[PDB]
């Protein structure tokens, strides 16, 4: 399987290139190399401040006729400060302009938490806590559905939503388009078995982010767990004659998830895409699943008091 079918009738490439932390001066090249080596899915976000440069790469590959638009699956996300109904279209249009596209294949609500609109991505009060906005995810969802009806995005989805929050949408009175995807953190240390089973049971595709444990996360404390250096995982990689990163990318692929490893290193980009020629045994799968620790790379600690903070619930 190269792609998964979404509840909107389209197929999403199970492997995509992530761009969080991909510096503006290296991500144009990273995306160009990725398409050249076969990637057909790019994960982006206005909050990553590098969409214009990712856009250059895409436009050049289209222009060079290396790939056609219908063959690409581009994803972006609505940042928290744009949850207000009157701000969603504008945020979507800014991202389409920076990426130089006429439509997005998928547009996601980045976080269930809406913040106060303004220039600051994380507006804080005189103590730090983020200043929420009185918008609710349901109203925000309605504005997202309007983008589909306006031709701006082909599918809409969510990210970092817990199962009760997914249920909130599925239960929205008047619900017109169900979320096609829920992109959540997923790797051997945060396996997400309940939230994934819940989503798949609802026909919602799950995209696993930080599949490698985001070793380049800014808040990395060199004492923290490290997937790429876990000997149990390297032994598994060793057995299949693959790299540990290849094992970590193949792992969610076999649980029927979409996976989006990030790299701005050409050789890594190529290496990461070489995950369709081997299979992990169900025994390897269950062993990897056993390493779960409920360890999160992205906990959004600055919003633990927000009404819609997603991680107080067990899933
Ligand atoms: N919805 C959300 O809230 C979130 C979405 N995401 C999405 O998921 C993507 C991927 O997750 P991310 O957090 O970036 O972290 P990843 O788990 O993808 O790991 C990226 C780090 O791993 C390194 N790496 C990549 N390939 C290899 C390799 N083969 N061997 C050794 N090291 C490697 C990269 O190095 P280098 O680049 O130097 O090669 C980088 O430092 C994000 O970029 C973003 O698109 C991420 C977080 C949150
Ligand atoms: N991207 C943010 C980074 C600062 C931030 O607050 N990041 C959050 C979100 S992580 C990331 C998730 C993603 O990639 O979508 C993001 O949106 O920036 C975070 O890591 N919180 C846990 C903490 O208190 O340290 C920014 O600079 O605007």
PDB file of C-alpha atoms and ligand atoms in Angstrom, residues 16-23 26 30 39 42-45 47-48 50 75 77 79 108-111 158-160 182-187 207-217 219 227-228 243-246 248-249 259-273 297-298 300 311, ligand 1:
ATOM      1  CA  UNK A  16       5.201  12.215   4.057  1.00  0.00           C
ATOM      2  CA  UNK A  17       7.981  14.704   4.691  1.00  0.00           C
ATOM      3  CA  UNK A  18       7.627  16.743   7.886  1.00  0.00           C
ATOM      4  CA  UNK A  19       8.866  20.403   8.007  1.00  0.00           C
ATOM      5  CA  UNK A  20       8.723  21.512  11.641  1.00  0.00           C
ATOM      6  CA  UNK A  21      12.174  22.886  12.506  1.00  0.00           C
ATOM      7  CA  UNK A  22      13.285  22.678   8.922  1.00  0.00           C
ATOM      8  CA  UNK A  23      15.197  25.970   8.617  1.00  0.00           C
ATOM      9  CA  UNK A  26      17.532  24.415   3.868  1.00  0.00           C
ATOM     10  CA  UNK A  30      14.949  19.266   1.474  1.00  0.00           C
ATOM     11  CA  UNK A  39       7.852  11.663  -1.556  1.00  0.00           C
ATOM     12  CA  UNK A  42       4.528  17.157   2.512  1.00  0.00           C
ATOM     13  CA  UNK A  43       3.373  18.178   6.062  1.00  0.00           C
ATOM     14  CA  UNK A  44       3.451  21.964   6.640  1.00  0.00           C
ATOM     15  CA  UNK A  45       2.156  24.635   9.032  1.00  0.00           C
ATOM     16  CA  UNK A  47       3.432  28.268  12.521  1.00  0.00           C
ATOM     17  CA  UNK A  48       6.616  26.660  11.192  1.00  0.00           C
ATOM     18  CA  UNK A  50       8.809  28.214   6.391  1.00  0.00           C
ATOM     19  CA  UNK A  75      -1.085  19.354   4.193  1.00  0.00           C
ATOM     20  CA  UNK A  77      -2.634  23.519   9.642  1.00  0.00           C
ATOM     21  CA  UNK A  79      -2.843  27.932  13.895  1.00  0.00           C
ATOM     22  CA  UNK A 108      -6.009  20.573   9.911  1.00  0.00           C
ATOM     23  CA  UNK A 109      -6.965  22.419  13.099  1.00  0.00           C
ATOM     24  CA  UNK A 110      -3.407  22.400  14.554  1.00  0.00           C
ATOM     25  CA  UNK A 111      -4.531  22.222  18.179  1.00  0.00           C
ATOM     26  CA  UNK A 158      -7.751  17.747  13.255  1.00  0.00           C
ATOM     27  CA  UNK A 159      -4.499  17.452  15.210  1.00  0.00           C
ATOM     28  CA  UNK A 160      -3.708  16.773  18.834  1.00  0.00           C
ATOM     29  CA  UNK A 182      -6.283  13.212  13.362  1.00  0.00           C
ATOM     30  CA  UNK A 183      -2.532  13.786  13.353  1.00  0.00           C
ATOM     31  CA  UNK A 184      -1.092  12.869  16.710  1.00  0.00           C
ATOM     32  CA  UNK A 185       2.241  12.103  18.259  1.00  0.00           C
ATOM     33  CA  UNK A 186       3.013   8.408  17.916  1.00  0.00           C
ATOM     34  CA  UNK A 187       6.194   6.319  18.396  1.00  0.00           C
ATOM     35  CA  UNK A 207      -1.111  10.381  11.030  1.00  0.00           C
ATOM     36  CA  UNK A 208       1.819   9.729  13.368  1.00  0.00           C
ATOM     37  CA  UNK A 209       4.116  12.674  14.017  1.00  0.00           C
ATOM     38  CA  UNK A 210       7.520  12.821  15.679  1.00  0.00           C
ATOM     39  CA  UNK A 211       7.936   9.149  14.703  1.00  0.00           C
ATOM     40  CA  UNK A 212      11.590   9.378  15.556  1.00  0.00           C
ATOM     41  CA  UNK A 213      11.064  11.128  18.864  1.00  0.00           C
ATOM     42  CA  UNK A 214      11.925  14.577  17.505  1.00  0.00           C
ATOM     43  CA  UNK A 215      15.605  14.418  18.625  1.00  0.00           C
ATOM     44  CA  UNK A 216      15.910  18.024  17.355  1.00  0.00           C
ATOM     45  CA  UNK A 217      13.081  19.291  19.620  1.00  0.00           C
ATOM     46  CA  UNK A 219      13.455  21.494  24.680  1.00  0.00           C
ATOM     47  CA  UNK A 227      14.470   6.251  20.397  1.00  0.00           C
ATOM     48  CA  UNK A 228      17.226   6.403  17.883  1.00  0.00           C
ATOM     49  CA  UNK A 243      18.470   1.450  10.191  1.00  0.00           C
ATOM     50  CA  UNK A 244      16.715   2.151  13.456  1.00  0.00           C
ATOM     51  CA  UNK A 245      15.077   5.179  11.747  1.00  0.00           C
ATOM     52  CA  UNK A 246      13.817   2.800   9.038  1.00  0.00           C
ATOM     53  CA  UNK A 248      10.657   3.530  13.478  1.00  0.00           C
ATOM     54  CA  UNK A 249       9.112   4.642  10.195  1.00  0.00           C
ATOM     55  CA  UNK A 259       3.874   8.735   9.028  1.00  0.00           C
ATOM     56  CA  UNK A 260       5.751  12.005   8.491  1.00  0.00           C
ATOM     57  CA  UNK A 261       9.479  11.861   9.452  1.00  0.00           C
ATOM     58  CA  UNK A 262      11.292  15.175   9.201  1.00  0.00           C
ATOM     59  CA  UNK A 263      14.803  15.729   7.785  1.00  0.00           C
ATOM     60  CA  UNK A 264      16.646  18.442   5.925  1.00  0.00           C
ATOM     61  CA  UNK A 265      19.543  16.050   5.264  1.00  0.00           C
ATOM     62  CA  UNK A 266      19.483  14.690   1.696  1.00  0.00           C
ATOM     63  CA  UNK A 267      20.897  11.262   2.549  1.00  0.00           C
ATOM     64  CA  UNK A 268      18.517  10.878   5.456  1.00  0.00           C
ATOM     65  CA  UNK A 269      15.585  11.978   3.281  1.00  0.00           C
ATOM     66  CA  UNK A 270      16.405   9.202   0.799  1.00  0.00           C
ATOM     67  CA  UNK A 271      17.066   6.650   3.557  1.00  0.00           C
ATOM     68  CA  UNK A 272      13.769   7.384   5.271  1.00  0.00           C
ATOM     69  CA  UNK A 273      11.786   6.655   2.082  1.00  0.00           C
ATOM     70  CA  UNK A 297       7.594  15.316  22.789  1.00  0.00           C
ATOM     71  CA  UNK A 298       4.782  17.833  22.329  1.00  0.00           C
ATOM     72  CA  UNK A 300       2.161  22.232  24.932  1.00  0.00           C
ATOM     73  CA  UNK A 311      -3.696  15.869  27.439  1.00  0.00           C
TER      74      UNK A 311
HETATM   75  N1  LIG B   1       0.531  18.325  14.587  1.00  0.00           N
HETATM   76  C1  LIG B   1       1.472  18.702  15.450  1.00  0.00           C
HETATM   77  O1  LIG B   1       1.256  19.369  16.462  1.00  0.00           O
HETATM   78  C2  LIG B   1       2.896  18.249  15.117  1.00  0.00           C
HETATM   79  C3  LIG B   1       3.233  17.839  13.830  1.00  0.00           C
HETATM   80  N2  LIG B   1       4.547  17.425  13.566  1.00  0.00           N
HETATM   81  C4  LIG B   1       4.915  16.987  12.198  1.00  0.00           C
HETATM   82  O2  LIG B   1       5.677  15.763  12.280  1.00  0.00           O
HETATM   83  C5  LIG B   1       6.945  15.993  11.642  1.00  0.00           C
HETATM   84  C6  LIG B   1       8.022  15.012  12.120  1.00  0.00           C
HETATM   85  O3  LIG B   1       8.225  15.107  13.535  1.00  0.00           O
HETATM   86  P1  LIG B   1       9.438  15.951  14.178  1.00  0.00           P
HETATM   87  O4  LIG B   1       8.939  16.494  15.465  1.00  0.00           O
HETATM   88  O5  LIG B   1       9.958  16.911  13.177  1.00  0.00           O
HETATM   89  O6  LIG B   1      10.586  14.898  14.573  1.00  0.00           O
HETATM   90  P2  LIG B   1      10.978  13.508  13.872  1.00  0.00           P
HETATM   91  O7  LIG B   1      10.562  12.437  14.813  1.00  0.00           O
HETATM   92  O8  LIG B   1      10.526  13.421  12.467  1.00  0.00           O
HETATM   93  O9  LIG B   1      12.581  13.610  13.932  1.00  0.00           O
HETATM   94  C7  LIG B   1      13.293  14.656  13.270  1.00  0.00           C
HETATM   95  C8  LIG B   1      14.739  14.605  13.759  1.00  0.00           C
HETATM   96  O10 LIG B   1      15.208  13.294  13.397  1.00  0.00           O
HETATM   97  C9  LIG B   1      16.355  13.451  12.546  1.00  0.00           C
HETATM   98  N3  LIG B   1      16.402  12.354  11.548  1.00  0.00           N
HETATM   99  C10 LIG B   1      15.579  12.231  10.507  1.00  0.00           C
HETATM  100  N4  LIG B   1      15.893  11.145   9.807  1.00  0.00           N
HETATM  101  C11 LIG B   1      16.926  10.562  10.408  1.00  0.00           C
HETATM  102  C12 LIG B   1      17.684   9.427  10.138  1.00  0.00           C
HETATM  103  N5  LIG B   1      17.352   8.626   9.129  1.00  0.00           N
HETATM  104  N6  LIG B   1      18.714   9.127  10.946  1.00  0.00           N
HETATM  105  C13 LIG B   1      19.006   9.879  11.995  1.00  0.00           C
HETATM  106  N7  LIG B   1      18.293  10.955  12.282  1.00  0.00           N
HETATM  107  C14 LIG B   1      17.255  11.331  11.516  1.00  0.00           C
HETATM  108  C15 LIG B   1      16.219  14.828  11.888  1.00  0.00           C
HETATM  109  O11 LIG B   1      17.537  15.318  11.630  1.00  0.00           O
HETATM  110  P3  LIG B   1      17.898  16.285  10.394  1.00  0.00           P
HETATM  111  O12 LIG B   1      16.679  17.028   9.999  1.00  0.00           O
HETATM  112  O13 LIG B   1      19.082  17.068  10.809  1.00  0.00           O
HETATM  113  O14 LIG B   1      18.298  15.256   9.225  1.00  0.00           O
HETATM  114  C16 LIG B   1      15.609  15.637  13.034  1.00  0.00           C
HETATM  115  O15 LIG B   1      16.622  16.140  13.908  1.00  0.00           O
HETATM  116  C17 LIG B   1       7.206  17.454  11.992  1.00  0.00           C
HETATM  117  O16 LIG B   1       8.253  18.018  11.199  1.00  0.00           O
HETATM  118  C18 LIG B   1       5.852  18.021  11.570  1.00  0.00           C
HETATM  119  O17 LIG B   1       5.701  18.046  10.146  1.00  0.00           O
HETATM  120  C19 LIG B   1       5.514  17.441  14.583  1.00  0.00           C
HETATM  121  C20 LIG B   1       5.173  17.868  15.863  1.00  0.00           C
HETATM  122  C21 LIG B   1       3.864  18.270  16.115  1.00  0.00           C
END
